[PDB]
Amino acid sequence: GRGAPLAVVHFRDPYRYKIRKELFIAPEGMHTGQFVYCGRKATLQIGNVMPLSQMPEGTIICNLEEKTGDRGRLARTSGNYATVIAHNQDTKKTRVKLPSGAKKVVPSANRAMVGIVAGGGRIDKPILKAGRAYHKYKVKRNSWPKVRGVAMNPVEHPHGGGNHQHIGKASTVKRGTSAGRKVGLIAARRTGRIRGGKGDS
Amino acid sequence: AKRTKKVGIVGKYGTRYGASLRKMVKKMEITQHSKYTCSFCGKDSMKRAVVGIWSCKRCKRTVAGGAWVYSTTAAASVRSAVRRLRETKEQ
Amino acid sequence: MPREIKEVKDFLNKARRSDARAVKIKKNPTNTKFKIRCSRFLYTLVVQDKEKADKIKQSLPPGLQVKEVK
Amino acid sequence: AAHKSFRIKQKLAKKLKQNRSVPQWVRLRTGNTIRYNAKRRHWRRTKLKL
Amino acid sequence: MVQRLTLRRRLSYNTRSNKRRIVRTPGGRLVYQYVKKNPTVPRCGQCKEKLHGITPSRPSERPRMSKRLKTVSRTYGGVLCHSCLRERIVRAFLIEEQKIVKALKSQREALVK
Amino acid sequence: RRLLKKYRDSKKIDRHLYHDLYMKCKGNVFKNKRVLMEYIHKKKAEKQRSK
RNA sequence: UGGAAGACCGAAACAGUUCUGACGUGCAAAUCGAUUGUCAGAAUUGAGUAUAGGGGCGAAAGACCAAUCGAACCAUCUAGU
RNA sequence: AAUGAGAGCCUUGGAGGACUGAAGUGGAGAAGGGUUUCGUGUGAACAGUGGUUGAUCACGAGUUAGUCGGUCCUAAGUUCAAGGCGAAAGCGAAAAUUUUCAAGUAAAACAUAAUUUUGAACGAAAGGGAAUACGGUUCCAAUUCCGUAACCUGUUGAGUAUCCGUUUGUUAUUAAAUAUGGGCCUCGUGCUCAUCCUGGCAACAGGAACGACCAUAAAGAAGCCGUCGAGAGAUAUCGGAAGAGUUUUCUUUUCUGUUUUAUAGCCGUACUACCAUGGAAGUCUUUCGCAGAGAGAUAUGGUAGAUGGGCUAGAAGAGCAUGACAUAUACUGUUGUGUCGAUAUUUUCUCCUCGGACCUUGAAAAUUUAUGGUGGGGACACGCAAACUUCUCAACAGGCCGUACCAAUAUCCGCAGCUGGUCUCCAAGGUGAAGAGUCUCUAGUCGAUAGAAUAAUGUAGGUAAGGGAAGUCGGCAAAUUAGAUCCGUAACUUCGGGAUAAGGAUUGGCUCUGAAGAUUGAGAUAGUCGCGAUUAUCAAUUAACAAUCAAUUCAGAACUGGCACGGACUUGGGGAAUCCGACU
RNA sequence: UGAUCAAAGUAUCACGAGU
RNA sequence: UGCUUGGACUACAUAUGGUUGAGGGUUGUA
């Protein structure tokens, strides 16, 4: 239920004389047996993890911490990557572009693995059978093949109902409309075909 | 016999699931199951174990890769880019 | 009676043991076998010769009880 | 069941004792209401059930 | 026909710990006995290529067995893969050897500054 | 293939020839038992004439 | 040669298409016959186990939740009016 | 036939028609039942009928385990001690915070000194899993009683490198000497070294030959389908110890009978993996299926799992099977014989080596072991030794709870001995593609209240000239069609299908013939001893070389019958359009 | 693609006991 | 010691007494 494979990477524990193995998120070009070096004083090599001050801008990173020591919140799933866009010298921040095209500013102490997370493009295969859609879901959780609430009855959904055939009100519903009126297009700024040049400025 | 000119591998899916979808399948199911050159053994003995993981039958060096392809198009560019920035920072 | 003793000399060593209160002797027209009960291996020597079998009956130590299955 | 837990076996065992027809000399007592053992549990008439 | 077969165990089901091999029992009665899963060879586990000289037993039968049967006498009897043990002596040797070459080069460079 | 196997030890045909023949076991042209040796002997014979 | 597929014919299996058949104070508070769908997988299912009432669950019929569901059952308010 | 008051069933033999038809109405178990099991007595009530008999009614008996389950363990998941919150209870709560709530030492000096953060537990009689077999025995019980033989765990005793440098013995040789070293002194038993195993190049071999302690790995540990390799039991079939049956005729025929345990020792393949030799090109080796080879193939020589089988111990001319003898006989004793092949089918399973499929990639925990490392102790050679020894044998102990039978048209749940529902294990012959249907054998039934009539009307099953859907809401019901092999095969199409399109041919029996496999052997010559025996040589021979053994497949040809030929059974009517949802 | 625990070292004092 | 049987004990919250403790809370002797 994670499309991206993980690496079991085993280290010395510098505190007790024992091997402690931790699960990192496997970047492409991470072959078993490559030495990975996790550090401030690290060479920029795939999959070394380095605090973001150390990597020159336009380096791509995976597994990036939003707060230093929060163990790598971002870019965990297949082919997503953040790019270091540069730095704000005052209050030691490295600014990144998130895989949403959203740009966010993060402290430079934040560690990130130089990488593009393996089995990407997981998306490319269309499917063909809904047996495989079932098989995907039964690993993950009970994400039901989505029964249309129109098809139902008005007790069951506010959208179902009908001699004829409707939602009957804009499926576009407020943020403030309070649960369970959030059947649909929850605060749609614009609805109807996205025309054009998508990518944030 | 070249039994089927058009379908090749997508003849498993036969009549079901519309021709345009079946053309897309043909490329991907060729790239997966295909023996790739292992950079670490120089032998073409690398086959797809599972979705993102390619194990070389000999040397047993198991490499992380793209889901259908050992090297995804993004990756090649990715790896060259980081490498080039590495040179300028050092000297 | 799980353990086989092919060799006469070893069977006799087991005859003078702290254990082996009981022996069974059977003279069979198929195969004449000398059985010694130590409770969990009972050991058996099969003397195939039959001439050797008549003489091997004593060398059995006398303090040991023998069942003379005819 | 078929191999009954010990607690069950004790309860059933007591129940087997109950299934006996009253000694007929007890029926002859002065102000003896007891004609019969009448709580005779015959297994396919009255279970124990539930 | 001949002689049909009865479950000695109350575990009726074809479940993994219930497998039955057919045995001509001496009275000719032909009755089933219950067979334990055939033990899978302990693996050489850095490349899982099945340990020579090391007995396959259901794990809790390796203290009901002699200590010598579980063992190949040299360093990394079970743990490492024989062929892979030549590799792993070599690997360690080289990492250590060429580090000394690096260390000697740095020492000389410091003096000669 | 087993016919070729026996022949390999005796030594009648060269290893080279056996390979070509072994690949022709698979892929029909040696249809019966009877076809295979008639071909072997013709191959041998054609080589004897050239030699 | 090989042996893929929520493939097809059809058993075990599951379901219940049509006869608007038998039965319909029956064997049965849903059975029986004929006929028939499907049967290697979004299959069939047991045990353990979770979800409980204006709630759940629902491949969604307002269906089902112990012969009971357009809001279970049980007691009480309640000999309610 | 027997018995009784009465007997179609139910009481029952013998007999006789059949039934289910080994995917069971059989033989076991779980879930369930709760005395229902079984003997005896046996009447009324009950068995919608009778009923002497029963799952009834009355009276007794019966379910014995260290090794099978429960137990133990964890899973999904749960019970709950918290800081809290609640009206409290409790939390349709997993809250989980709680000095060190934590696990801890065969450890001592200076915060003793290392590490280590929900305590706790329950939760599967199908998951995981300490360890039992065979025969006999009850009315009713057995992997359980008994007999006999094992196996595990805990614990307890003995043994398991060592006898040397040296030497008693021997003038020496030599031997005890597992293997001892070096030097001195005329010499020495004088100085004196070791001894927590050995061998193999390796793959790795073995009976033991430092658990104190750390880390690390493996086992436990896992879907589905397909095929291969190998086995067990069933099956097919021949001979030969036996019996039975048929025997008008024919039949060495038909049926049946020929068995081998846990456990241990040795052997140990197909397969695979690995090692040594060696260096392949002219691609080789090779699978059914294409996997490997300068990451070392082929080949040659080995090694290893004990995978599967063999032979022995087990096994008292055992036990047990078969046919006889003794005693009317029982009980019991005695007499032989228990054996030789062939095959792949699996109307079955197990196990090995593999692969297909996947936006599925196919448990966890207890538990067990392995290896590296750091202590220490044992560190005398006249050699004593020892060794949680995760050794080899023997001693003792192993508690707690369950165990009958039923598992279904009569022991379950439905008011019921109710055509209902209710999970699985077990696998005979023939036909055949089938674990199909059908018949049969074994096992189990023959109870479904019956007899006589066998009306109508039914129900359930069929047939019907000639016409052939005119019927009807509507081809509904019914029929045609069906398997196989061969020939032929459209519209349309997403090129995969449509397709078994349509449309045609043919199918028995008997008698021949061909094709399709396995294995060694011949042939020719020479020497020796009396065609026989012993020894030596060589490649061709080679498509069945020939010979023999195997076991059926696919094809072709006659003869032949009254069109009889998928003869039972199995088993699509077809085509042309339209509406609708893509599809399962 | 591999292993790290037992502070060795160095320095200063203790430099006691037994023979 | 081993093996085996019987009795009595071993919940939690909490007060007090008991003694061990403890914190760069904080005081003092040095």
A-chain CB neighbours of B24 within 8 Å are 125-126
Token output for C57 = 């009956």
Helix-strand-coil split of chain E, %, nearest 5: 30, 10, 60
C1' (H74) to CA (E22) span, angstroms: 33
E48/H374 CA-to-C1' distance in Å? 30
Angstrom distance (rounded) from CA C45 to CA E8? 35
Contact B72 A55 (CB under 8 A): no
Secondary structure (DSSP) of A141-165: --------TTSS-TTT-TT---SS-
How far, in Å, CA of D10 to CA of B44, rounded?
Answer: 73
Compute the distance between CA of residue E104 and CA of residue A109 in angstroms, rounded to an integer.
35
All chains having 3 or more CB pairs closer than 8 angstroms to chain E: none
Using only C-alpha atoms, what is the Rg of chain A?
23
> Are the CB atoms for B45 and B57 separated by under 8 Å?
yes
- Cβ contact B27:B16 at 8 Å: no
Bridge partners of residue A25, in order along the sequence: A6
Q: Which bases in strand H are touched by protein, i.e. have an atom under 7 Å from a CB?
A: 22, 26-36, 55-59, 68-69, 115-116, 125-131, 133-136, 143, 149-153, 197-199, 203-209, 214-222, 231-235, 257-265, 273-275, 281-296, 298, 300, 303-308, 312-321, 349-353, 356-361, 366-372, 390-396, 401-407, 411-414, 416-417, 423-428, 441-442, 494-497, 515-519, 539-545, 582-584
**Alpha helical stretches, state H, chain B:** 19-31, 73-90
Bridge partners (DSSP) of residue A62 are A113
DSSP A84-109: EEEEETTTTEEEEE-TTS-EEEEETT
Cα-based distances in Å from E3 to A124, E7, E29, E31, E35: 60, 13, 7, 8, 19
Instruction: Give the separation between CA B39 and CA A176, rounded to whole angstroms.
Output: 56
Number of Cβ within a 10 Å radius of residue A71: 9
Number of H helices, E strands in chain A: 1, 8
Helices (H), C1-70: 8-15, 51-56
Strand partners, C24: C35, C67
Alpha-carbon dihedral angle through residues E99, E100, E102, E107, given to the nearest 10 degrees: 150
Nearest CA to A116 out of A10, A42, A21, A25 is that of A25
Separation between Cα atoms, residue B59 and residue A33, nearest integer Å = 11
Neighbouring C-beta atoms of residue B69, cutoff 10 Å = 20
Angle, CA A68 vertex, CA A65 and CA A73 arms, to 5°: 20
Chain B interface includes A194 (CB < 8 A): no
Give the span between the Cα atoms of D41 and E1, in whole angstroms: 45
Phi, psi of F39 (to 5 degrees): -65, -45
Between chain A and chain B, the number of residue pairs with CB atoms below 8 A apart is 112
DSSP E41: P
Q: How far apart are CA C46 and CA C4, in angstroms?
A: 9
Q: Say how far apart CA B87 and CA A56 lie, in whole Å.
A: 10
Neighbours of A167 (CB within 10 A): 18
Contact A96, A64 (CB under 8 A): yes
Confirm if A38 and A49 have CB atoms less than 8 A apart: yes
Q: Is B9 helix (H, G, I), strand (E, B) or coil?
A: helix
Conformational region of residue B60, where left means phi above 0, alpha means psi within -120 to 50, and beta covers everything else? left
Structure tokens at A38: 């996790």
What distance in Å separates the CA atoms of residue B86 and residue B74, rounded to the nearest whole number?
19
Residues in Cβ contact with E27 at an 8 Å cutoff, skipping those fewer than 6 apart: none
Whether chains F and C touch (3+ CB pairs under 8 A) is answered by no
Separation CA D15–CA D10 (nearest Å): 9
User: From CA F43, how far away is CA F35, in angstroms rounded?
Assistant: 13
Structural Rg of chain C based on CA atoms: 11
Place of tokens 């130089």: A114
Cα separation of A146 and A162, whole Å? 19
Say which DSSP state A27 is in: B
In this structure, the number of other CB atoms found within 10 A of the CB of residue C11 comes to: 21
- Which residues are CB-contacts of E102 (< 8 A; sequence separation ≥ 6)? none
Provide the residue type at C34 as one letter.
F
Which residues 60-79 of B are in CB contact (within 8 Å) with A? Answer: 61-68, 71-72, 74-75, 78-79
Contacts of E2 (CB under 8 A, 6+ apart): E30
CB A156 within 8 A of CB A149: yes
Is the peptide bond between A47 and the residue preceding it cis, with omega within 30 degrees of 0?
A: yes
Please, are residues D42 and D19 in contact by the beta-carbon 8 Å criterion? Answer: yes
Burial code (b: 16+ CB inside 10 Å, e: under 16) for A104-124 equals: eebbbbbbbbbbbbbbbbbee
8 A C-beta contact, residue A116 and residue B71: no
Q: What are phi and psi of C8, to 5 degrees?
A: -60, -40
What is d(CA E106, CA E102) in angstroms, rounded to the nearest whole number?
6
Residue type, D40: R
User: Rg (Cα) of chain F, in Å, rounded?
Assistant: 11
Tell me, in Å, the resolution of the deposited structure: 6.0
Answer whether B30 touches A (CB < 8 Å).
Answer: no
CB E29 within 8 A of CB E3: yes
CA–CA separation, A77 vs A64, rounded Å?
12
Extract the tokens encoding B49: 């174990």
Q: Which residues pair with A23 in a beta bridge?
A: A8
Q: How far apart are CA A114 and CA B82, in angstroms?
A: 8
DSSP structural state of residue B33: T
Phi, psi of A28 (to 5 degrees): -65, 140
Reduce the secondary structure of A31-52 to three states and give it as a string: ECCCCCCECCCCCCCCCCEEEC
CA distance B68 to B31: 6
For residue B2, what are its two tokens? 């070249």
Determine the distance between A16 (CA) and H111 (C1') in angstroms.
19
**For the segment 46-65 of chain E, residues whose CB is within 7 A of strand H:** 48-50, 52-53, 55-65
Six token digits for residue A90: 């005052």
In one-letter notation, the amino acid at residue D2 is A
Q: What 8-state DSSP symbol labels residue B36?
A: B
Instruction: Provide the 3-class DSSP secondary structure of residue E27.
Output: coil
